[PDB]
Structure 1
Amino acid sequence: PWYSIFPIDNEDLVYGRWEDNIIWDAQAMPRLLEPPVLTLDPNDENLIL
C-alpha cells in the first residue's frame, strides 16, 4: 500500500476538543476566547495551494 485507501481524516475533528469552543453561558464563559487566524489546511484537495 503506497498510499492509504482511506482519506486522512481531519485531525482537529478526530482529536481536538472542539467542545471547548461551545459557548454555554455568554456572561459566565469559563475560557477567554481569542480571534482565530485562517490556517488554509493543505491536506484538503480542491484547494489549489
Structure 2
Amino acid sequence: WRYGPARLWYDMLGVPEDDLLADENFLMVTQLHWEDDIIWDGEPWYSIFPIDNEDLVYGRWEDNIIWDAQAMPRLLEPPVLTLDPNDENLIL
C-alpha cells in the first residue's frame, strides 16, 4: 500500500501505482551461560497459557533477510498492515 505506513519511504523513492552445523551445537544448553541462573544466597475453557506469535514460531522470517542487495534470490513485495487482533493493548 503506497499511502499506508512507510508512505514516507515510498514518496522518497517516487513509486506511484495506486559439523558446526550439527543440531546439538544450537541446543541452548551448549550456548547459554545457565550457571548465572543458579540462585546462591538469594535475597481451561479459555487458554490458561498465552498464545505465541504464529509467524515467529512457525514462519520462515529468515527469508526476509537480504543477504546480497544486487543478487537477491527472490523478488520482495510491499507489505500491507495486517493489525493482528490476537495482541491485547490494541483497541480493535
TM-score normalized with structure 2 length: 0.52
Which consecutive unaligned segments of at least 5 residues does structure 2 have?
Answer: 1-43
Following the alignment from structure 2 to structure 1, what is the Cα–Cα distance between the partners of residues 48 and 74?
A: 39
Give, in angstroms, the shift of residue 6 of structure 1.
Answer: 1.6
Question: How many angstroms does 1:35 deviate by?
Answer: 0.1
CA distance in 1 between partners of 2:75 and 2:65 (Å): 12
Q: Matched residue pairs, number?
A: 49
Q: CA deviation at 1:5?
A: 2.1
- The one of the two structures with greater contact order (alpha-carbon pairs below 8 A, sep at least 6) is 2
SS at match of 1:25: coil
- 2:60 equivalent among 5, 13, 17: 17
Judging by fraction of residues, say which structure has more helix.
Answer: 2
* Residue-by-residue CA offset, 1:10-45 (whole Å, 9 max, x unaligned): 000000000000000000000100000000000000
Q: Any runs of at least 4 consecutive aligned residues in structure 1 with deviations exceeding 3 A, and if so which?
A: none
Please list every run of 5 or more consecutive structure 1 residues that lacks an aligned counterpart in the other structure: none
The farther-off stretch of 2-11 and 35-44 is: 2-11
Percent identity between the two aligned chains: 100
SS in 2 for 1:40: coil
> What TM-score comes out, normalization by structure 1 length?
0.94
